[PDB]
Amino acid sequence: NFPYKAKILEEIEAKKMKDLEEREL
Amino acid sequence: MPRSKRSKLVTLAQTDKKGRENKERIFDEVREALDTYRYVWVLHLDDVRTPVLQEIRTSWAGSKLIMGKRKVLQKALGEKREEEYKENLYQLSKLCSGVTGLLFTDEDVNTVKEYFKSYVRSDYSRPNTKAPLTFTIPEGIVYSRGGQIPAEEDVPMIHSLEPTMRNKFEIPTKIKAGKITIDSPYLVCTEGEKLDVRQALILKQFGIAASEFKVKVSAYYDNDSSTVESTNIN
Amino acid sequence: AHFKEYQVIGRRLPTESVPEPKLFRMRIFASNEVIAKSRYWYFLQKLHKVKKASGEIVSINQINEAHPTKVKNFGVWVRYDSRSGTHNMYKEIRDVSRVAAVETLYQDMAARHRARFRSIHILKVAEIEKTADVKRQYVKQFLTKDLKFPLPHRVQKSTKTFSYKRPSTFY
Amino acid sequence: MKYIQTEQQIEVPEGVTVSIKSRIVKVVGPRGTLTKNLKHIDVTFTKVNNQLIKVAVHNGGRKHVAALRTVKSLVDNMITGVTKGYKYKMRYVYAHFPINVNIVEKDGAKFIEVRNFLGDKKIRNVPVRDGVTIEFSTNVKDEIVLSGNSVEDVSQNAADLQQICRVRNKDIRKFLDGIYVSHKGFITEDL
Amino acid sequence: VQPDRRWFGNTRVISQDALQHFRSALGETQKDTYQVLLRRNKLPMSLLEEKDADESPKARILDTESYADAFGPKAQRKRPRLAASNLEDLVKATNEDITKYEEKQVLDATLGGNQEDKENGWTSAAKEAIFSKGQSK
Amino acid sequence: AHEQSKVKDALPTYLLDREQKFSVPLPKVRGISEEEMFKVIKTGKSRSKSWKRMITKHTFVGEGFTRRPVKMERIIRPSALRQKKANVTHPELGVTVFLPILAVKKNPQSPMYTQLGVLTKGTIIEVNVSELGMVTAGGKVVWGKYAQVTNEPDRDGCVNAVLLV
Amino acid sequence: LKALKDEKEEARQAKITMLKERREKKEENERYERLAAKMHAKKVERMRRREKRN
RNA sequence: AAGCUCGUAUCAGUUUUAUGAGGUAAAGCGAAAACUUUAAAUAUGUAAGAAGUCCUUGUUUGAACGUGGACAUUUGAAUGAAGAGCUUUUAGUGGGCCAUUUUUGGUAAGCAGAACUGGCGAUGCGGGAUGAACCGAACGUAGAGUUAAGGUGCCGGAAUACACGCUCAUCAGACACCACAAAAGGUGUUAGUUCAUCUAGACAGCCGGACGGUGGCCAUGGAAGUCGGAAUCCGCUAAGGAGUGUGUAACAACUCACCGGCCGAAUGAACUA
RNA sequence: GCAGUCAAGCGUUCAUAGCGACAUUGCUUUUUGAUUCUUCGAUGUCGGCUCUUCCUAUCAUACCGAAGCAGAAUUCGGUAAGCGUUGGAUUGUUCACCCACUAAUAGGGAGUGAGCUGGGUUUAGACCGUCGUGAGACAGGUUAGUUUUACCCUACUGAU
């Protein structure tokens, strides 16, 4: 029922494409 | 409303609601009808028996006829003028009034109007119209048919459906010896009347179908001309 | 109390070979900086294994509403640890400032879930910009056009004990 | 959930004048006049124009709006009752002992005496209410008619006339006597 | 209870030849009033006992006609068992049955009686509470 | 059931269509003091010279009980509290049968209770087993087995025991 | 959300498959080691050769 | 109590620092939880300088059994303090309940054993309407002031205070709980959470269809979907069960489940509080 | 009660680690209403006149609901405590048992251990029974056997 049913997982994935990538290099 | 809510009764049976299945099926079906069949007909078969429906739908083979929910038919054929499968189909989709009603063929442009100007079948009164019958159940001990034919050839009515003549139909009946007996002669209808819901359902109970029934025709559509003919015969 | 919204920062104790640590930050609702910082430590502890003995607090500031006049429709997330297994919850508050909305939210929680300040965790308080993002009734009632409703049987409040009028409710 | 306000729109036909003071209601139509005291209800009426009334409830809870709807239906029943009248037809079926019904005057108070119900010697007297007419119909044996402009009056009268004729200690699958409401409808007929 | 090889250690087995030996003297054993019984040295009854019966243990019908088929609105039976066939033998049965009912009728008619007294209405008194002097708990 | 209906061993002929560590299942039963299961019986119009006791738990007395003279008897196990059979089930076969109690072997919490044959819970009694009909290799036939009781015969009257195959 | 939770459940099943294969292989090592630890490698090669048809 | 030997650089129901053990397991990385390094407090344990510290040789290089010689006070962690020590001596004392915490075993349910720490007794005072154990609380005689626990409709000193919610009980509740009847029912009310349907018209209502092959096959006096057993097909479809129920002695007739016409906006279901 | 099956739902998510309602499955003597002439140790004393009151968990009476309830008579259930609920028999006993009336012969609380009173503790008498080398005891059974409100204060009833 939250209105911002779009931005949330988008921000989580913006985080994840960095939390994953800042292991290797 | 937390509580004190109308509980929706569940009675068990084998079938079940479909959902969007048959509706999407109907959309695509009229799609793969429009792609082939050149001659399309519109029909308004308001009050029909399914026997009559089957025996009009089977009458010819090289055909295609649909009983599609009007809104689905319109959203398929084109809801507005511009957007549509083919041209001028809005011209037809603006012309729905009943259980419409869509015939697909590639044949004579006149044999169907001939067949309809021929077609008659007997049916119930289907109320709000003239009834060529003035049905007075005679005050003598009633019979199953309604009181127009010899009595020694006909069976007296059934006790169990006396309450449904007293309650839903309001004719003064007191059972006697197991039988339905009335006191004063009653007429359930005279001729000409805009028949009432009961002034029809009583005829439906007494099982007397004497009403002309015909399926009409209003318009047309061609996959060559790409527009609509309309000769108004009903 | 009369709430305020602090923003707290923390830089869990630096070391050589692991210096200049990551500088986390939170928005806290509290009455006094003391309680803000206590909540902040606790939220760290619950998120991941940090501690107070092995971490430090950098700068606790206080924020304010850039427009504490414009009436805004806040939508709040909440979640809490009581009294069975946890759960989430989404409520809405048509109010004027975020700290006010959270005041009323704590009130409603203590009224309905009976649940106290230990469990309730604010997750996200978002100011809705468009109508038709509001979906709740008791908030959409006031979002209608040309509102005009009368006061609820406005009963008098007396200062003296014996009156001489048989008061009339207003009207 | 305490709706901010809810409204119910009474419809008024032509030849009928509804006058509502503080909360008393008085309807005047071709049949006559009816009156009901709605002090117990907490609503707010307001005239729109000569063919429409609105009953509103502000800040209504749950039971409140529940009551609002019945207020609208009560007033509308009064309207149909002063424009079209009400008419309950009853029958009295007897097995062996004929039931006799008659309109008598005890001091002049319009009673219905039911005599020889299943052979009793007791005379069941039921008091016709005020402003309700009673005629034993012709061309239909057994049938009596309670008509009026009030609905609760006529209905409650018929109900008492039936409840006075219960069959006590007898199996009711065998003893099919009594006075039953054949039908409920309007004086007119057309509608 | 400490674990053991007993308790799962079988106890009191007995042999084919022991059953053969002692099933044998039941139709022999020489018992008179000039010899009484003192000890048992218990022997397995459920196997050593149970002489033969040639009486055809009463048939059972439950698992074959439950109740709702027997009687009730279900009544899943119409035709009798064993559906008598020989009409002459049946009327033999029924006439001899009425006559034999008359034979028992005359048994009760001869022996009694109490019906005439109960039509007079009187009854015999309470047998005295003294006539229970030996039958007390 | 209706929605399931909507979704859509191997006995022989001479049998089908017919329907039915070394740890003892029950160590560590509770301990019965010597004041329960021993009631006192004062003797004399002046109740002063008791010396008599009465067992209160369901016992098993044997086959030659034949109550001993009144002057000399000091323990009394009254006839209402006696047993000659026990309703004992099987781990396997999924069965239960009423078997006469031959004798009692082990009564936890006393050897004197065992000498006396008191059937308190946990006790292991030696019961006839003829009906369950077991034959081992060679397997002459067993007509006596061991079985542990699993219900106080005081919170009810029955004795419920289970067999150790 | 449903596609992403599908991918993360597939991650869970991935760790499932890796742990099951490693555990079962290290348990087969466990078994043959705990058997042959005492008795002769001749008897263990001969049991290899008595099961070798399965 | 007295004596004598210090006013202790000495002690302490305490912390720290060190090193201890129980390492529960968050490490994590191993060869693929797979170790074993290890970790917080969890809770105890001994130790932190004056005779100590050493420099120099006699002894079965070691360990010191012997000397002699340097470093009084930055003389060696935080905090508190003067009541610390030792000899002779002398009166009462010995019974026992409650709670908390650590722990072992229990069963109808209680509970039993331990160990530690309060309290009670020898002890009043405020509060809990009353009271062995509950909440506050350092008892000379008085004055002023301020508060604890508990409270502020009246009894009764102190807001019929302010603010947000909830509840109507045909004997509410004010409960004391972080107990018992307690698992459930309820068409009371409020808020939520997980699910779908819906202008290719949602729910409620009326009206219409609810069909042929096919009285499907057995069983029988009749059992045409509806006493009974065995599956449940296809057709044309919009749907329609070899039929949900009322009904007939047998079909009819009504119905439902299922479709469509009318209307024109949420409604449905299941859980949690 | 015991031994199981379920499996609603719950359980670091765990049904196949675990629990686990309602249901269910097993005899404790048998299948043709056969009999029943089978009653099994109360450790602590029981049972009765006069009298009042209360409870409802109702036997009768009042009014209703459902029953194949035709009538009659019942069976079950709802509100209901206003009113009523007996006369005898049985001590080689009775925690009960019978027959007779009746509308019915309901179930309990506060009783009546100084209002009275008999089974039972029965101290000095005595007799047999059982155990003992014994005085004696008690596994028993049998009998006869003087505790005296109230004149005080209140309660209750009446009286100035």
Side-chain angles (χ1 to χ4, degrees), chain B:
Chain B
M1 285 311 305
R3 293 169 158 262
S4 81
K5 64 171 321 297
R6 176 188 163 161
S7 284
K8 279 309 183 69
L9 181 63
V10 45
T11 80
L12 296 183
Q14 293 307 326
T15 174
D16 212 13
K17 304 307 204 199
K18 287 176 295 287
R20 212 180 178 90
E21 263 64 37
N22 203 15
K23 315 211 302 178
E24 72 224 8
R25 179 193 89 101
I26 280 327
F27 202 119
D28 63 63
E29 256 197 339
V30 195
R31 285 280 141 278
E32 49 221 10
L34 291 201
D35 74 327
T36 74
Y37 300 136
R38 213 189 299 134
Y39 311 136
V40 187
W41 289 118
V42 49
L43 317 89
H44 299 80
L45 40 149
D46 283 289
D47 282 346
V48 66
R49 301 155 16 188
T50 315
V52 167
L53 161 69
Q54 297 223 159
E55 302 153 49
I56 189 156
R57 202 202 258 151
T58 34
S59 29
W60 26 72
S63 34
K64 182 60 159 178
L65 189 56
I66 308 289
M67 308 303 140
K69 209 199 300 198
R70 253 174 74 258
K71 282 314 168 65
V72 196
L73 179 137
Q74 273 131 8
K75 290 298 306 170
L77 275 306
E79 199 76 3
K80 66 168 178 50
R81 191 253 157 260
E82 302 80 18
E83 178 188 0
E84 34 187 345
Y85 181 104
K86 286 154 161 177
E87 201 47 54
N88 290 86
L89 264 71
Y90 71 102
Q91 307 254 72
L92 72 85
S93 44
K94 55 190 51 179
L95 324 165
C96 294
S97 157
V99 211
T100 294
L102 182 69
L103 185 61
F104 286 103
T105 33
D106 267 3
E107 35 75 40
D108 193 63
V109 288
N110 300 109
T111 203
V112 274
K113 60 100 189 179
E114 293 164 70
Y115 176 89
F116 290 140
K117 292 205 83 68
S118 77
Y119 198 109
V120 184
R121 193 79 79 233
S122 86
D123 194 328
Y124 303 97
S125 190
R126 292 320 212 190
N128 309 68
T129 188
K130 199 267 321 191
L133 320 104
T134 65
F135 270 133
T136 86
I137 314 104
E139 48 138 40
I141 164 173
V142 316
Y143 309 94
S144 43
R145 288 289 288 103
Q148 319 86 37
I149 42 190
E152 294 80 19
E153 80 179 30
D154 212 47
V155 56
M157 215 174 294
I158 291 137
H159 77 279
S160 74
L161 43 73
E162 187 273 350
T164 179
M165 310 184 330
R166 176 161 52 67
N167 280 312
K168 296 334 283 163
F169 297 150
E170 290 196 46
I171 47 185
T173 62
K174 166 153 74 76
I175 311 198
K176 280 275 194 50
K179 285 79 202 167
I180 287 161
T181 76
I182 74 170
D183 41 335
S184 290
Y186 183 97
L187 43 83
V188 69
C189 87
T190 85
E191 197 166 1
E193 180 70 13
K194 214 57 55 193
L195 299 162
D196 186 87
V197 293
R198 58 175 294 264
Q199 294 171 39
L201 293 151
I202 304 148
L203 277 69
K204 164 170 295 289
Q205 184 205 222
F206 289 150
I208 287 170
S211 319
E212 190 246 333
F213 169 72
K214 54 177 173 182
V215 176
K216 62 194 285 190
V217 42
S218 51
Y220 163 92
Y221 194 88
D222 200 24
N223 298 251
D224 159 283
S225 87
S226 153
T227 179
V228 159
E229 303 169 23
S230 280
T231 293
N232 210 305
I233 60 154
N234 283 3

